[PDB]
Amino acid sequence: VNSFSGYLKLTDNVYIKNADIVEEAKKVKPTVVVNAANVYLKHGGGVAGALNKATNNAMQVESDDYIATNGPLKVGGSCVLSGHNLAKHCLHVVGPNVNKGEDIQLLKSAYENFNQHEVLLAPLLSAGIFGADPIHSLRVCVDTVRTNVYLAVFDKNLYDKLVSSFL
Numbered sequence: 339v340n341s342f343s344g345y346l347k348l349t350d351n352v353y354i355k356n357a358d359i360v361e362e363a364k365k366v367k368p369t370v371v372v373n374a375a376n377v378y379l380k381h382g383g384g385v386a387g388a389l390n391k392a393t394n395n396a397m398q399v400e401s402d403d404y405i406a407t408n409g410p411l412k413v414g415g416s417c418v419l420s421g422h423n424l425a426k427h428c429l430h431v432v433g434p435n436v437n438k439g440e441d442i443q444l445l446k447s448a449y450e451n452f453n454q455h456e457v458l459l460a461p462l463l464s465a466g467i468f469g470a471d472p473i474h475s476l477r478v479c480v481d482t483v484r485t486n487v488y489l490a491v492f493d494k495n496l497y498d499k500l501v502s503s504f505l
């Protein structure tokens with residue numbers, strides 16, 4: 339039994355809700371919140387800019403030190419950093435950004451990072467400003483993630499389309 343509330347159940351292990359991931363994170367304090375990161379951990383907009391703003395820029399400060407030590411992530415890769423005031427940990431996952439021409443097949447590799455964590459609060463990878471089709475992202479998520487994932491979808495309209503079209 340966990341503390342996530344109001345989710346619709348899509349499969350054995352995937353759940354979905356219309357929620358602001360920042361507000362869901364601050365209420366739930368999940369063990370892991372997933373950030374829709376880029377390889378430079380530059381949290382300027384989208385989910386990343388919102389999560390970072392909610393940490394009063396502490397996420398960005400920590401991220402800049404991570405990059406200075408380790409260099410950029412790979413597209414499809416991830417790193418575990420602090421969750422600050424939002425979660426115990428933040429799993430920064432780099433989905434492909436279609437608006438940069440990155441290979442959408444890397445989306446499956448990106449979701450594989452979720453399998454290293456028993457339970458996660460997450461956005462749909464490569465959706466929003468990363469330019470991929472969110473319906474496709476949900477399909478890859480369901481077909482790749484085996485651990486328990488609670489998906490937050492900010493936009494009520496897209497949420498309804500994702501549910502109504504789910505196979």
Ligand SMILES: O=C(O)C[C@@H]1CN(c2ncnc3[nH]c4cc(F)ccc4c23)CCO1
Binds near residue numbers: 374433463467
């Ligand atoms: O980057 C991707 O792969 C897909 C993303 C997913 N995004 C979100 N998902 C869930 N909760 C979210 N709260 C937000 C608050 C904001 F100010 C901006 C974006 C979000 C947001 C929307 C942008 O696209």
